[PDB]
Amino acid sequence: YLVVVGAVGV
Amino acid sequence: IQRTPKIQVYSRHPAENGKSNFLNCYVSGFHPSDIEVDLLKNGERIEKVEHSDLSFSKDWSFYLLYYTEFTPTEKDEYACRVNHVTLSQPKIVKWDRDM
Amino acid sequence: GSHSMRYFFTSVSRPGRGEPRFIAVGYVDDTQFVRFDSDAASQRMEPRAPWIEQEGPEYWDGETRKVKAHSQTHRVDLGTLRGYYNQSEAGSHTVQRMYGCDVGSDWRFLRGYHQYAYDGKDYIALKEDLRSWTAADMAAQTTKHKWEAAHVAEQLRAYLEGTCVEWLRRYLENGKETLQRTDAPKTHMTHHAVSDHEATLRCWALSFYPAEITLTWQRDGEDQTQDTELVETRPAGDGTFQKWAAVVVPSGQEQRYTCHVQHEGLPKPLTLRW
Ligand code: NA
Ligand code: NA
Ligand code: NA
Ligand code: NA
Ligand code: NA
């Protein structure tokens, strides 16, 4: 089950 | 940034002439991920060859398994041919029965 | 014993034409269970183990949405990092991300991780406390300041200690017939002369799962490393692993040498002697 929250870019 | 592939060429099962088996070429420890891997029967590229999905180790170096069904015989020669940006010429590793 | 869920993401820029190549893999322990490849036809998260196939369409729609969102983040990051490192648009570069969670012997949360690399070198990593970041260089320090302000560690800690271990335990139950089965190594020794005076003993471990194993040689009950060779653990291709260790011995003295095999599937370590 992948991370749900929108990923923060570097 | 550039790491050369380690190569193992081996059979899934103990090799017996006339008995169906799988020929494996395991490439690991390489960066970047772009790599050419062929399985050779008597110097000729095998068409049916599949590979695992790209993954990597703790050190970020990549590994792939390339494999095909094969029936070993007394006479037929098998090899793995690997090209990578770290190699000046494609590296050919012959399949040895008990390696 | 302990169990892990891990996702591995690789994105490789294609400066000549088009978008980066993106490959995502999911593992439970040493078992791949899902994949996404931007080059494949489906454009979906795909099953790679029978026990994940029982998940319904809601699951596959969700994992496809998330993995596509992950791919776009990595596409943007390749552009951001080219900027941070003052690199030209002409060269191919690589981003890698790995995250996941371990449960311990008590089946509770043990540890979480979230690690990022640029061109195969450490970039930024979540520390074991899941509260702080390890930034390798001043580009990664810029990311660290951004991620501190956005409370990224708090968002990942919530996933790693909660959602991640709940779904890991779900997968371990659904796939228990294989995921909770140990395959003890099938072991044997081979012998062949390398000269009139010396022979190679090769200790084989085959068809084992999980991959973690230790092969050691002793001579007269004491560890020997000199005149030995140990190959990297390698996949059989059927989900199990292989390894061998060899020692060169004086011909006729083979009986002095023992191969010791340690594996989770062995109640006691095995001792092999020619
Ligand atoms: Na052998
Ligand atoms: Na552990
Ligand atoms: Na896919
Ligand atoms: Na696809
Ligand atoms: Na071990």
Author numbering:
A (entry chain C): 1 to 10
B (entry chain B): 1 to 99
C (entry chain A): 1 to 274
Quoted from the paper:
The conformation of the peptide in the HLA-I groove is paramount not only for HLA-I-peptide affinity and stability, but also for the TCR-HLA-I-peptide interaction. To study this aspect, we individually refolded and crystallized HLA-A*02:01 with spliced epitope candidate KRAS5−6/8−14 G12V, non-spliced epitope candidate KRAS5−14 G12V, as well as two control peptides (peptides #1 and #2), in which either the N-terminal residue or one of the central residues was substituted, as compared to the epitope candidates. The global superposition of all these four peptide-HLA-I complexes in the peptide binding groove reveals a similar binding orientation with a root mean square deviation value (rmsd) of 0.124 Å. Throughout these interfaces, extensive hydrophobic and hydrogen bonding networking is seen with the majority of peptide residues participating in the contact with HLA-I residues Y7, F9, M45, E63, K66, V67, H70, T73, T80, L81, Y84, Y99, Y116, T143, K146, W147, V152, Y159, W167, Y171.
In the KRAS2−35 G12V polypeptide digestion, we also identified the non-spliced epitope candidate KRAS5−14 G12V [KLVVVGAVGV]. Some structural differences in individual peptide binding were observed when comparing the 9 mer peptides (KRAS5−6/8−14 G12V [KL][VVGAVGV] and peptide #2 KLVVVAVGV) with the 10 mer peptides (KRAS5−14 G12V [KLVVVGAVGV] and peptide #1 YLVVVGAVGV). Specifically, while the N-terminal and C-terminal ends of all four peptides match perfectly, structural superposition reveals conformations in the middle portions of peptide KRAS5−6/8−14 G12V and peptide #2 unique from the remaining two peptide ligands (KRAS5−14 G12V and peptide #1). In the latter two cases, the middle portions of the peptides containing P4, P5, and P6 residues bulge out of the binding pockets to accommodate both peptide ends inside the peptide-binding groove of the HLA-I molecule. In contrast, although the structural superposition of KRAS5−6/8−14 G12V and KRAS5−14 G12V peptides bound to HLA-A*02:01 molecules reveals a similar type of HLA-I interaction network at their N-terminal and C-terminal regions, their structural arrangements deviate in their middle portions. In the HLA-I-KRAS5−14 G12V peptide complex, the HLA-A*02:01 K146 residue adopts a different orientation, due to which it interacts with only the terminal PΩ residue. Furthermore, though KRAS5−14 G12V is longer [10 amino acids, compared to KRAS5−6/8−14 G12V (9 amino acids)] and reorganizes its central region in the HLA binding groove, this structural rearrangement does not favor any additional contacts with HLA-A*02:01. In the HLA-A*02:01-KRAS5−14 G12V peptide complex, the middle portion that bulges out from the binding groove makes it more accessible for TCR recognition. The side chain of P4 V and P5 V residues are facing in an upward direction and can be easily accommodated into the binding pocket located over the central peptide, formed by the most structurally diverse CDR loops, CDR3α and CDR3β of the TCR.
